[PDB]
Amino acid sequence: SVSKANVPKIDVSPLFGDDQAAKMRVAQQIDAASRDTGFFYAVNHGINVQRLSQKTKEFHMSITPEEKWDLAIRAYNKEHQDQVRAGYYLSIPGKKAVESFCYLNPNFTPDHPRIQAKTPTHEVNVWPDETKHPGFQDFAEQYYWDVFGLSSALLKGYALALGKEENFFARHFKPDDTLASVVLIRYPYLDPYPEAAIKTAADGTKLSFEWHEDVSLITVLYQSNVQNLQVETAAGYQDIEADDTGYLINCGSYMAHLTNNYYKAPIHRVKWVNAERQSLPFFVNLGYDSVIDPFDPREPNGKSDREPLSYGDYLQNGLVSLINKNGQT
Ligand SMILES: N[C@@H](CCCC(=O)N[C@@H](CCS)C(=O)O)C(=O)O
Numbered sequence: 001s002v003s004k005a006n007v008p009k010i011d012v013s014p015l016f017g018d019d020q021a022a023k024m025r026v027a028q029q030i031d032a033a034s035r036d037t038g039f040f041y042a043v044n045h046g047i048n049v050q051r052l053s054q055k056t057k058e059f060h061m062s063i064t065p066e067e068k069w070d071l072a073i074r075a076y077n078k079e080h081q082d083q084v085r086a087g088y089y090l091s092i093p094g095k096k097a098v099e100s101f102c103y104l105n106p107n108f109t110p111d112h113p114r115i116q117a118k119t120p121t122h123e124v125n126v127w128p129d130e131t132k133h134p135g136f137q138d139f140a141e142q143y144y145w146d147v148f149g150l151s152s153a154l155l156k157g158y159a160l161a162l163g164k165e166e167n168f169f170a171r172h173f174k175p176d177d178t179l180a181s182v183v184l185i186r187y188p189y190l191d192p193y194p195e196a197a198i199k200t201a202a203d204g205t206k207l208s209f210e211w212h213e214d215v216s217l218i219t220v221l222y223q224s225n226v227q228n229l230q231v232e233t234a235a236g237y238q239d240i241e242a243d244d245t246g247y248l249i250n251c252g253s254y255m256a257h258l259t260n261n262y263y264k265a266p267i268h269r270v271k272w273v274n275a276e277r278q279s280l281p282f283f284v285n286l287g288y289d290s291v292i293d294p295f296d297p298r299e300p301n302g303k304s305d306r307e308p309l310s311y312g313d314y315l316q317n318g319l320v321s322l323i324n325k326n327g328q329t
């Protein structure tokens, strides 16, 4: 069978405060985990995850087939040509078991300059009716800002870990323009579970989603307490243990580009488990025009032979690529 991945628990609460030495000792732990399996659990993060999970369960269990079509992205509903990222991603029963709801920055309103310009990757969120889902929109928008705050603090820790000043990433991660997304994913219990909805890895492992690197700077994930993720390491795929009190953190491929693969984006995959569960990732993306010049923390002059890449170019190309590689979610 499969060995357990080294996924350390890191107390990130110093990243919210003003004790600089304490922040450096957290940054060393982020450096060590980023150089090893590429995952860690952030603990003492301050977010009420049990309430997050209850509000998300109340949504997923009450939304109706009618509302799903009315919120659906354009892959499922040709009438919704402006919904590429934000909205409902339907299951196809008998075939594709998972379903999800994605939303973006609540500041992308109709008056926002990037929405007015129809800039790629910016959309206005769609929401179910308030009378059918009382409090859901307000809860989900507040959640966005709670996990934005955690992610800002983690970005301070990654900056310090790389030998940079603490706002090195955080200065590009801003409420008015971040391209970050929340996805509320439901994995169902089904009996019988359709075989068509189960993928098979080359090593025979049954999967819900195949190997990939994330399209993100970092990913900040809350999951139910059901083991399912695996990370590829030099010793093969290893199981990431569950912990539904902490947030599971890893780097995405923009971090790997910026750092010349010093912090790799770890390749990971989702095992098939026949269980009713939740997966609530926040993909930490910067602004459309954000560019950070690539560097290499293993080279004495810190220079890299990678070209600067704007975050908007990275994100539009990555979201398309991920769909082409592993299919429409
Ligand atoms: N819709 C989100 C991005 C979602 C990206 C995505 O599907 N990631 C999956 C890939 C599994 S094959 C994952 O990390 O498990 C957005 O528009 O920001």
Ligand SMILES: [Fe+3]
Pocket: 212, 213, 214, 268
């Ligand atoms: Fe992923």
